[PDB]
Structure formats: C-alpha cells, structure tokens
Design a protein around this nucleic acid. Structure first.
Ligand SMILES: [Mg+2]
Length: 87
RNA sequence: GGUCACGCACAGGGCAAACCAUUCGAAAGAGUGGGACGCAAAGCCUCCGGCCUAAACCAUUGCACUCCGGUAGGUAGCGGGGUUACCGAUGG
C-alpha cells in the first residue's frame, strides 16, 4: 500500500501552478527530501498534487502528520499513490 | 497587354525579429517610438489544425509522469486555407 509519492486531493484550484508547488514544498519539506512535486491544472489534474519523497518513511509521516490540514482555506486529503513511475 | 502560375533577377523599394523606452492588459500578448534577425506577400482575414495565456464565469473531487474542459483572449513571423497586390530574367 505505501509509496514514495503522496496523492494530495481537494486543493484550491485558483492557486497558480508556481505558488502551488512552492507552498507544497514549503510545507512538506520538513518530512524528508523531495525529488519533484507534480502539479498540473488540466481538467483531469485540477485540485491535485503528487509529492515524491526520497524515502517512503518520510512519505508515511507526511501523510499521517498532515491529513486534513487546512491549506488555502481548504482541507488537504492525503492518500498514497496507486502506482509510481520515475524513481 | 489581360489572366493563371512561377521566383534565377531587375527597378521602386516595403515590412520589421530579439532587445530597449513607453502605453494597455490578470496574463499570453498587443499598440506607439527607437532598432534590424529575417521575410516574394513578414499585406490583410482566426474558417481548419498546432501552440501560448487563464482574471471572470460555467463545469470538474479528478492517479498523473506526450499533451489536452467549456468560455474568452493571443500568435497571420507555427502551418493550412481565403482574399488583395509591385516588378517581369530575349522570363514560364
Ligand atoms: Mg508571390
């Protein structure tokens, strides 16, 4: 079930792609080193985020420690990634 | 000569990329002035495709690692297509 990547859900879609990544990096980096943050604003990708960690353990902490956390007046919905491409 | 093509020139020369200044714009970008990388339609039109922007509105709770909702705006110097047009290689 666990994964290097965490699937953040229910995000404010009004945030600019640049700020969104930036803020997510500014909030999740305290859990572990981040490879890259995948954010896209297409109809299929809106309000969603993929945060890829070096270590699954750091992804595990980030999920458990910050599930529900209000972010741009909206509660984050963190769950594990189903499948993970890249490293 | 007219027309339909064509560009190896000729003559008048035309336009003006990047960058800078300034204006408008949420932005992409455009206007104007300076400036020239190039352009035989780099004149003009967003009909078809591509690409860029996403402030408002509409819709979307969506598992990606080609890239993508509508609506709107932009690019005609991204192609196609439409339309107009100067010169005329003893030119075809
Ligand atoms: Mg011609």
């Amino acid at each position: 079930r666990p994964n290097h990547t965490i699937y953040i859900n229910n995000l404010n879609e009004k945030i600019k792609k640049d700020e969104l990544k930036k803020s997510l990096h500014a909030i999740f980096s305290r859990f572990g080193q981040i490879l890259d943050i995948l954010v896209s604003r297409s109809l299929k990708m809106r309000g969603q985020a993929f945060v890829i960690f070096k270590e699954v353990s750091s992804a595990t902490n980030a999920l458990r420690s910050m599930q529900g956390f209000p972010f741009y007046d909206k509660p984050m919905r963190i769950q594990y990634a189903k499948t993970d491409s890249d490293i």
